[PDB]
Amino acid sequence: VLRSVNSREPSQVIFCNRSPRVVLPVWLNFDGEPQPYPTLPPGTGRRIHSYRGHLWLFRDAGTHDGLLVNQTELFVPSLNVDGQPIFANITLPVYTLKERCLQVVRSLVKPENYRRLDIVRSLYEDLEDHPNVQKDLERLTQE
Amino acid sequence: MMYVKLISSDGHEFIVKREHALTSGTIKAMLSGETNEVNFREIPSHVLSKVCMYFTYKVRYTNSSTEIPEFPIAPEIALELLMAANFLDC
Amino acid sequence: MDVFLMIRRHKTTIFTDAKESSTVFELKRIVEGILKRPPDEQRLYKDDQLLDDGKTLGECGFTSQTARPQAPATVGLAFRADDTFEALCIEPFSSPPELPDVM
């Protein structure tokens, strides 16, 4: 279900990183396969060439934490009105406190030492279940 | 404007907007089970103060188009804050 | 422009927001609605400095850039106990434990 439409209609976009993370843009190809594109440092923007009907998602390039684009999960380039490029505003979501805590703990502890933390077994498994694109694509497919 | 009191394990009393506290489903169940006071025997004030800052941050930046800043978490409180967040479902 | 605050006295911390253009007296009316003490029985502070009722929060140093939702600015509160005001006292939060070796 989640794949780019082969419209062959150019759509010029500005990927605008309004987050403190290094952003990894991901294009869902014609077979639904996630294709990584060059990263964007925090606070930077790039004018990119895409097509109408194409599917994009944005992640933190280092940890694969999910990011929002125009307040939602997926970005679909649309029709350029009067030659104006479409802004793809990439922002941090309002993560849950739990997800934000899991991010901070993952950034301080090597994956080998998650088992040495004095926490309940369910939290060790939550730490090990690192954010991933395939898992989110399956979540978004079921929905 | 309705407010609720969240009391830490060390006796600090945090008065937050009722709408903000209701971010936690666990808190909502403890309020709709004094009458608008919840005691947290396991959550110290260095953790409970940060949970209240999270509620403010969440209510302010949810569905907002003004660039969202990172929610800061000092490494020293990350483990207990993770446990509190897991219990509170927030 | 909204400013995000922690009004603190002893072991009480009120989390609230206010306009940067709103005054110290208007903030005392907010405290009155919560702690049930009139503005004439309250003293508000920014650090050890007593704040004037007619001053806006912005004039007192509470700016949106320094009083954020995720990191609110602290306003000290002292109540009038019979004839005299008590000394400004804010009980500190608990100390976090030592960071584990794995962190």
Ligand SMILES: COCCOc1cc(-c2scnc2C)ccc1CNC(=O)[C@@H]1C[C@@H](O)CN1C(=O)[C@@H](c1cc(C)no1)C(C)C
């Ligand atoms: C042009 O030189 C190589 C760089 O190409 C690019 C780099 C970036 C990024 S993303 C972050 N930083 C940068 C610079 C973004 C885009 C591009 C080039 N632009 C692209 O690669 C676009 C993006 C996506 O819509 C698929 N695509 C295609 O061209 C695909 C295509 C062709 C037709 C017809 N229909 O689909 C092709 C890969 C099969």
